[PDB]
PDB file of C-alpha atoms in Angstrom:
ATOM      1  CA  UNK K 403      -5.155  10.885 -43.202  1.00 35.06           C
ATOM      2  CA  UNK K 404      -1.799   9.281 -42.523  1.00 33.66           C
ATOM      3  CA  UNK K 405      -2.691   9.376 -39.129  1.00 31.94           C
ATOM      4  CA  UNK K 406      -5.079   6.566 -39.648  1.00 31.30           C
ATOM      5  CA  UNK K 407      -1.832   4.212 -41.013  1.00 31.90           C
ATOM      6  CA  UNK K 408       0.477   5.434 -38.276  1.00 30.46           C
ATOM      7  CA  UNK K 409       1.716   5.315 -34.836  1.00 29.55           C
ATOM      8  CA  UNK K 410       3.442   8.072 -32.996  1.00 30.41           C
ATOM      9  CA  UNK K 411       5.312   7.804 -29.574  1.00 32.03           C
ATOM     10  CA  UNK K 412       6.537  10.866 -28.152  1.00 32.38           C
ATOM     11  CA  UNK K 413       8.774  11.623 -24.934  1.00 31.76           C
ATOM     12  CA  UNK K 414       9.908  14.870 -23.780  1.00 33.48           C
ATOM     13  CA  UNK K 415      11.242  16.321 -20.083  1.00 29.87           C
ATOM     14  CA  UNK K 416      13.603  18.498 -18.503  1.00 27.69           C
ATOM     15  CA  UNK K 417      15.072  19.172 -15.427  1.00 28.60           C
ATOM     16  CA  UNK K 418      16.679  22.140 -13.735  1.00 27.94           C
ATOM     17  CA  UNK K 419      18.756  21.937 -10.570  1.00 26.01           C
ATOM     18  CA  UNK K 420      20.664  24.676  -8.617  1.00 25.25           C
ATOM     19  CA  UNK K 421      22.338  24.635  -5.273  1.00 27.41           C
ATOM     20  CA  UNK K 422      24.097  27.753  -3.340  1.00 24.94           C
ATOM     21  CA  UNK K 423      25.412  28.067  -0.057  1.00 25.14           C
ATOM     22  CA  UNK K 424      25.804  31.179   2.187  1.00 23.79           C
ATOM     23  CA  UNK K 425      28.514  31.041   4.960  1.00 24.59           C
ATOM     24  CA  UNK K 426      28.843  33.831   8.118  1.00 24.69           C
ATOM     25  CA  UNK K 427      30.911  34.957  11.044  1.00 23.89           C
ATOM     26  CA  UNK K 428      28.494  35.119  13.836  1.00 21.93           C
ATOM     27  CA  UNK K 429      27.375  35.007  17.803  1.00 20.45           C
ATOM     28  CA  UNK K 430      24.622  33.915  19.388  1.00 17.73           C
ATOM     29  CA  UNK K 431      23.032  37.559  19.065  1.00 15.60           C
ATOM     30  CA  UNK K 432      23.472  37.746  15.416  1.00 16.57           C
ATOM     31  CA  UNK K 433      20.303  37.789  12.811  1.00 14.87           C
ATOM     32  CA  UNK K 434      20.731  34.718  11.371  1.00 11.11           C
ATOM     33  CA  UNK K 435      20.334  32.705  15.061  1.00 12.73           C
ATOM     34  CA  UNK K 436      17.697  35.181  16.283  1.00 11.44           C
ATOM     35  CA  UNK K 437      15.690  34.525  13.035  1.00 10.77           C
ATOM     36  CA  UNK K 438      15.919  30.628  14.077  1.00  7.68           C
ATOM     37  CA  UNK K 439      14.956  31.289  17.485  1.00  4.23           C
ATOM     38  CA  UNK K 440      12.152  33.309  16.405  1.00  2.00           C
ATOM     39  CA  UNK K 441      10.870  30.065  14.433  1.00  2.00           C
ATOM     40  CA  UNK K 442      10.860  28.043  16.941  1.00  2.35           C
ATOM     41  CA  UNK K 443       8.799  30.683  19.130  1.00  2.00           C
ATOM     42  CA  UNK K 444       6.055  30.497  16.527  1.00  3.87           C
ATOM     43  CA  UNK K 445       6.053  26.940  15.970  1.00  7.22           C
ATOM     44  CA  UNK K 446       5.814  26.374  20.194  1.00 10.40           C
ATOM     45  CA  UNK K 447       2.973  29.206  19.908  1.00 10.93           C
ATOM     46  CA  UNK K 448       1.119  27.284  16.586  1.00 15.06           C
ATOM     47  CA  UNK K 449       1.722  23.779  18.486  1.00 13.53           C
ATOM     48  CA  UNK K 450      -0.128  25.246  21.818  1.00 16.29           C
ATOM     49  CA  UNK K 451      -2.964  26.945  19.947  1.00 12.71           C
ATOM     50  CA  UNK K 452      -4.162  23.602  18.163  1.00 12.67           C
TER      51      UNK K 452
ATOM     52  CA  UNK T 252       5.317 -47.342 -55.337  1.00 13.75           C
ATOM     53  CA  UNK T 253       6.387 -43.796 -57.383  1.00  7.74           C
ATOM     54  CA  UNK T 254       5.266 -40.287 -56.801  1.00  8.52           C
ATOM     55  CA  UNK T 255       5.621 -36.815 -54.861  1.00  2.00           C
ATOM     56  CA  UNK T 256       3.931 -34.752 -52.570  1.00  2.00           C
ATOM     57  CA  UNK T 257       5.053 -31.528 -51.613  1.00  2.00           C
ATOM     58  CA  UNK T 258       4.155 -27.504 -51.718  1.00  2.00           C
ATOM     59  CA  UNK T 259       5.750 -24.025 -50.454  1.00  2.00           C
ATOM     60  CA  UNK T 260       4.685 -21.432 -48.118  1.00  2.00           C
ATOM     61  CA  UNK T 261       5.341 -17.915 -48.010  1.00  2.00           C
ATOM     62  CA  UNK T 262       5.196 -14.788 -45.364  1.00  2.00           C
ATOM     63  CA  UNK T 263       4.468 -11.253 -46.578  1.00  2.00           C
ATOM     64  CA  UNK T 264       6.541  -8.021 -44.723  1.00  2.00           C
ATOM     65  CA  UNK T 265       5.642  -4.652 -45.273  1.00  2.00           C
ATOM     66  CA  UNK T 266       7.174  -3.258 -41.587  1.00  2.00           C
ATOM     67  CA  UNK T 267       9.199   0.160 -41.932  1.00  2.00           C
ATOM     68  CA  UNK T 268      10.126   2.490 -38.504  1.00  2.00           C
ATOM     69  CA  UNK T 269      12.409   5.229 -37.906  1.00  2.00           C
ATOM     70  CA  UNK T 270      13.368   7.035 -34.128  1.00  2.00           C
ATOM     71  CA  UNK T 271      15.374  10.018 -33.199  1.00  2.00           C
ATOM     72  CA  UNK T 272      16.515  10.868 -30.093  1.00  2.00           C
ATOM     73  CA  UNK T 273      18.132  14.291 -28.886  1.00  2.00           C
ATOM     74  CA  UNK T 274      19.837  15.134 -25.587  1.00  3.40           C
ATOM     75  CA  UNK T 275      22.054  18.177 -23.913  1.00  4.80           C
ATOM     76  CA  UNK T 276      23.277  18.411 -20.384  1.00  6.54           C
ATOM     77  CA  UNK T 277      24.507  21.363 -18.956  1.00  5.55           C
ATOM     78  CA  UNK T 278      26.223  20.459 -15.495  1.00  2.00           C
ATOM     79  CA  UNK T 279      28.331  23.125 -13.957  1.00  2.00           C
ATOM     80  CA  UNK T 280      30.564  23.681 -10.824  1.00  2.00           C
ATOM     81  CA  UNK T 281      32.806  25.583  -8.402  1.00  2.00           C
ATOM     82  CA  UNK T 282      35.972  24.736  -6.954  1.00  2.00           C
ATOM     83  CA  UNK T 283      39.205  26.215  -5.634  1.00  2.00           C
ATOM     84  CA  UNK T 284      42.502  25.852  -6.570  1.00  2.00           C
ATOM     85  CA  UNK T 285      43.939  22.794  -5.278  1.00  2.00           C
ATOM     86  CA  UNK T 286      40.779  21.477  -4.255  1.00  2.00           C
ATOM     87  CA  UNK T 287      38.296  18.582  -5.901  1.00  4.09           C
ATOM     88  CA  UNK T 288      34.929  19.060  -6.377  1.00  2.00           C
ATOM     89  CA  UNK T 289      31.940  16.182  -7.324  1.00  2.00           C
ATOM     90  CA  UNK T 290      28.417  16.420  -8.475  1.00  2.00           C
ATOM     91  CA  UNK T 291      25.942  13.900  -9.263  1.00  2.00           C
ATOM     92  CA  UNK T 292      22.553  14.284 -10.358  1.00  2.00           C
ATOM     93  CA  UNK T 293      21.163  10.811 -10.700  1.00  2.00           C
ATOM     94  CA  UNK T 294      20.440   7.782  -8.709  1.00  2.00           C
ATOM     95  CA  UNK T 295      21.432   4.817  -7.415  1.00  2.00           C
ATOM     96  CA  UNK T 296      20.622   0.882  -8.269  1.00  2.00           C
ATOM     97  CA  UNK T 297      21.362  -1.599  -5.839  1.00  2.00           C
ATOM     98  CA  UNK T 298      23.589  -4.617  -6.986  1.00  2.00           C
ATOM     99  CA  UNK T 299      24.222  -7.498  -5.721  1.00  2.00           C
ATOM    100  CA  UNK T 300      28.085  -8.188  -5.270  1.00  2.00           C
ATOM    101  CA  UNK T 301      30.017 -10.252  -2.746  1.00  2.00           C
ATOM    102  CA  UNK T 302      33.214 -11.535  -1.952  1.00  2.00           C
TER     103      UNK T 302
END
């Protein structure tokens, strides 16, 4: 019943945050650039097919 | 000419509160020896300065 004689503000959050990064050696024939050039294939491809 | 006229007034309070407020942060880093490292998680506000 106190309820009925009371007033109640409530607040509550959080937040998580992590950030990594990943360096490598390469060429232009390693995975990591192929991988990129292989997005940019698809996204051409996608692009053309609308 | 003799007399008086005056009176009183009067408020009544009854107000009563209470608040509690709780916070952790839990920032964390990396850096090498010799080196300097900064983090912010946050914002910015502009203000308006000027020589």
């Amino acid at each position: 019943l106190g309820n009925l004689f009371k007033s109640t503000n409530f607040q509550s959050g959080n937040t998580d945050l992590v950030i990594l990064v990943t360096p490598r050696v390469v060429s232009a024939a390693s995975l990591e650039n192929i991988r990129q050039v292989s997005q940019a294939v698809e996204m051409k491809d996608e692009y053309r097919n609308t | 000419n003799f007399g008086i006229i005056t009176g009183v007034l009067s408020t009544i309070n009854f107000a009563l509160s209470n608040g509690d407020a709780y916070l952790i942060a839990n920032p964390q880093l990396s850096a090498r020896s010799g080196g300097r490292t900064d983090f912010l998680a946050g914002g910015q506000v502009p203000i308006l300065q000027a020589l």
